[PDB]
Structures are given as C-alpha cells and as structure tokens.
Amino acid sequence: AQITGRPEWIWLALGTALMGLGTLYFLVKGMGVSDPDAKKFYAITTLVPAIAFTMYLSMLLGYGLTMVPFGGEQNPIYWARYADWLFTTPLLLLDLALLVDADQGTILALVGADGIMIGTGLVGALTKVYSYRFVWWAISTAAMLYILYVLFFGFTSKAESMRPEVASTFKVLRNVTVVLWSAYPVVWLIGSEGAGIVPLNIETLLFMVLDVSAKVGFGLILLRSRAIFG
Amino acid sequence: AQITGRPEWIWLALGTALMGLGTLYFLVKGMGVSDPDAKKFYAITTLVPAIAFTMYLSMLLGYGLTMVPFGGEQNPIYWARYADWLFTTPLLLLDLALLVDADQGTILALVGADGIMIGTGLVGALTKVYSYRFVWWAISTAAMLYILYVLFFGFTSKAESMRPEVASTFKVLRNVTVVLWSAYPVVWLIGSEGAGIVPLNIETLLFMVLDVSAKVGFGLILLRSRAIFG
Amino acid sequence: AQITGRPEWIWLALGTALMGLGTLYFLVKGMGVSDPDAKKFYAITTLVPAIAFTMYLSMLLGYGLTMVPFGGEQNPIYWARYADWLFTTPLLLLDLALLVDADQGTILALVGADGIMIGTGLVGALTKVYSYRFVWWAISTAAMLYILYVLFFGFTSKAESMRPEVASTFKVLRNVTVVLWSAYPVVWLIGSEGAGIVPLNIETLLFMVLDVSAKVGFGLILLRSRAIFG
C-alpha cells in the first residue's frame, strides 16, 4: 500500500467520503415514490455522485495517475477525473434540461457538445509538448462557452413555466452551474501540470471543492426543491 | 499463428462456435415481422450474441489477454470479457425491462448501475497489488446486489400484466438471471488470477458455460415465448 | 513541433480546414428555428463535422498515430480515424432513419450493427500479424453489407412518404451513402498498412476526400433540402 506519500491523498480521500455519503443519502430520499417524473430526476442524481465516488477511489490509491512529460520533465496528471467528469456531466446537463423541459434536439446538441468539451480536454492533458496542450485547451473551453450560452439564453427563455417555483429553482441551478464550471477551466490552465504555477496540493484542493459543491450541492437543492415533487 | 499452446483455446473456440451460430438463428427468426414491438426485442437479442461472438474471437487468438502482475508474479487475465459483458449486459437488462414494461427512470438507474458494476470490476482486475483488487471487487458485487433487488422486488411487483403468459415468462427470465449472474462474481474471486485457487483451464470452462447459457438461453426462451408475439 | 516531415500533413490539414469551416456554416443555418423537427436534424449534422474536426487535428500533429508492426516491419496507422468515424457514423445513420421515419427497433439494430462494424475494424488494425488482420477485416465488412441492405431494401420500401420531395431527397442520400462507404473498405485493404500496395500519401488522400464528401456533402444536400423544412 502507498495511500500516503503523495500529499494530495488527504484531499482525495476527502472528496471520497463526501461523494459516497452523498449518493447514499439521495439513495434514501428516492426510495418508493409515485414520483416517476421526479423518480426520473432522482435516479439521475444518485448515479452522478455514485460514479464520482468509484472514480475518486481509484484516483486515490492505484488508478488515475500517469506521467505525461512535457516542457522538459515528468508530470503527474490524474486522468481519472477526465473519466468521472465525462459521464457525470452529460447526465447533469440532462437533469437541467428535463427539469425545465426542453426538446430532444436541443438536449442532443448539448450532450454531444459536452462530450467534445471534456474529451478534447483530456486529449490535451496527455498530449505532451505543453504548447500543443494549451492549443487543445482552447478548443475545449470554446465548447464550454457554447453550452453555457444555450443554458441561460436558451433555457431561461424557456424556463417559463406555469409554476413560479419551477422557474426560480431552475434559475438558481443554471447560475451555480455557470460559476463553478468556469472555475474548472481556469484552474486547470494555471494549475496542474501545464503552466505549473499552482502546486499539486492546492490544485487537488480546489478541484475537489469544485466536485463536491457541484455534484452534491446542485443535486441537493434540486431534489429537495419542489421541482421534483414528492 | 498460436491458437494452440494456451490450453484454454478449446474452451474459448467452443464459446465461439456457440455464440456465432446463435446470433445466426435468432437472426432468421426475426426476419420480416409486423412484430415491431417484438421486432424491437429481436434486434436487441440478436445483437447480444453478435457482440459476444466478435469478442470471443479476439480473446481466442490475439486480443483479450494481458499480464497484470500482482501478489508476486505475472498473471494472464482476459480483459476482453470485460468489454463483451459490458455492452451485452445493459442490453439484456433492457430486454427484461421492456418485456415487463417499466419506466425510463427505473431502467435508467438500472443501466448506470450495471455500467458501474462491470466497469469497476474491470478496474479491479488490472489494479495489480491483489489486496486492493479484492477491494474493488467488493464495490462491484455490491452494485450487482442492487440490480437483482430491483429485478425481483421491483419488476415482479410490476410484473403484473393482464396476460398470465407475459407474467410467467418474465418470472422465469428474472430467475435464471439471478442464478447465473451470482455465479459470475463467485467464480472470478476464487478462480482466475486473484485468489489463484481454480486453474485457468477450469476457470475458462465455467465462465464459458455461463456466457452461452445466459445470453443464448435467456434470449431463446424469451423470443420463442409468446411475450414477443409474432 | 513536427507538423511537417510526414508528407501526409498537407492532406490531413486539408481535411481539417474543410471540416471546421463546414461545422461552422451548418452552425449558422440552424440558428433560431421553429424547426425542432428539423432543428433535431440540424443539431445532428453540426455535431458530425465538429467531431471530425477535433479528431483530424489530433491526427495531424500529435495524437492518432501508433506503430502496429505486422508482416515484418513497423507500420504507421492513424487509429484516430477509427474514433471519429465511430461516433460520426451512428449519428449519420440516425439522421437518415429519422428523415425517412423508421422505428426504434429498426434503428436500434442498425446502430449496434455499425458499432460492431467500425469497432471490429479497428481491432483488426492494431491486431499485428497481418494474416489475422485481414480475418477481422472480413467480419467488419460483412456487418457493413448488412446495414446497406436495410438501408435501400428496408428504408426505401418505407421511404414512401406522402411527400414526393421527402421520398426523393432520401433516395439520393441512401445512394451516395452506399457508394462512398463501399470505397472505405476497399481502400483500407489494398491501401494503408495491410496489403501495403497503395502508399500512405495517396492513402491519406483518398480517405480524406471520402470524409469531406460524405459528412459535409451528405449533411449539405440534406439540410438545404426541404426535408428539414425551415
């Protein structure tokens, strides 16, 4: 065993306990419900932290870390996150979409949009030759800007519901979504092994807070909200 | 060529001939049908053995085998199965769901559930350091228990249909599902390279019987059954 | 940087500028539309070239190339294409299906069909030992023949619509689909590193023309067509 040495551990393990406990609680809240509309929402959320948990575990001890060398050294990146964020994200965006009640097409484009967002991101990470890395970085973030756009501009404009509650609750979700996410790109550029300005300890710290707050928080106000009645 | 040496070959090749021939027959049974409800079911099944076939081939000669070293040696695991079971399974569970006629949400959670079940399993396999291997092993099997639960408890409770036939046929499918699957976990722990108690020859034997019986058998009683009328 | 040496570059870079510019234009055409039926189609297309673009980039400079050694040497294959064609294709087939208006089941089988088509193809590429390579090659192409069959025979027979326009437009799409695709298999066998008869320069040339013409062309006549009204 070696779940020590690499300082980041404390941080990882933290994100872990939080994720697992979360999926567990939502797990309960869902139990038996004439909620099928909501039940749908529930299943989605529950799954989200679930994944984040498994991933975080691998990332902690064995899996998740490689040694992408760029610029002139051996960098330790945690690809694992690329996977977890990958599945977790299309699901999330889906949660919002349904909540507001969009349309296959709209959601469809949004899904593929994210897929390329993260996917490309990853490709950059492993890319080596830090210069090209940042290049791919540009592509990905661009995609991100597109999804955000459709979120407020598109969804809000639809966000009209007969129910003031549904309308408000959504607004909050779309907002928090915007802020937290934006952080993701920025942090990765200056931090992690790319610009190499922010140490790995703090880098893992920030990233972590982002995960728990986004998945667990978002999912919480959402389910607890009268949006998924019952 | 080297489709010899490794004794398991005879077993693999066996699973192969069985898989291919199967997908072929179902292939026929489906041909032209005002069955679209059933036609749906058909397409699903047919696909299932199809995949199992391709995979089994790779696994036989070239692809499918690595050398995950743990405990203190070089172990020969057939990751290929991890892939085949991966796609095949979400499909299967889907076949049941529709047959009984559930609801997006329910099926949704079940899908992600399996995904994590197998996925995590794999991660364990490659993990190295046999101790941690078993750890991931625990996580996966847990997920399995969850899916089974929803199957009988949840589906059976719904399994109510106006048609006694549909109700019974299902019952049988859910049952065989339970038994065969349970075998999968157990066998992998004591057998394969983890506990290293069951030789690879017999390990490949048992696993094989499990595949053919599950995919081909399940699919057979199902289609042949009046459930997918026409 | 090394976006030179390997001659193919000029060709790759070409496919690139074409892909990106394409996704950009369709991007516009879609903008704001009471078209949701069509809007659906739009989103699909747009996504298609988008992917092709990102992939083509990686393939150009860093990602996309390995060194699968078979026959008796070190061969340079561009796996990247395997990925791009992978996602792009199920989407395309979906575009056709909806246009004509099929049924979940039919489309479903078609989707899994393609998945295995390309997937297996790839497996062959990396396979090593050129003999076995061609073997997998046979499997894949077979699958291809199946999809084509359902396309004209199945879809055309359904292609009946009340709208002569919809009926014709489709016909054209299914046709071009047939020809271009057939090229794909042939070229890869004689060309690329397998038979080693067609040089890599020309091999990249032909493959390229195939991509741009198929994705961009198909998508063009389609959207511009009154099929996706609005």
Ligand SMILES: *C/C=C(C)/C=C/C=C(C)/C=C/C1=C(C)CCCC1(C)C
């Ligand atoms: C915990 C999972 C969440 C909600 C995922 C967040 C991450 C993003 C969608 C951000 C993606 C990135 C970019 C925009 C470009 C650079 C690389 C990434 C992956 C950090």
Ligand SMILES: *C/C=C(C)/C=C/C=C(C)/C=C/C1=C(C)CCCC1(C)C
């Ligand atoms: C032929 C394909 C089938 C129906 C797949 C069966 C396998 C399972 C879903 C079992 C999964 C496992 C665990 C529960 C934990 C240990 C590792 C696995 C993959 C054997």
Ligand SMILES: *C/C=C(C)/C=C/C=C(C)/C=C/C1=C(C)CCCC1(C)C
């Ligand atoms: C640009 C993307 C498109 C539409 C993809 C085209 C490729 C095919 C579906 C062809 C597949 C192949 C075979 C039939 C067997 C040999 C290997 C492939 C991948 C070239």
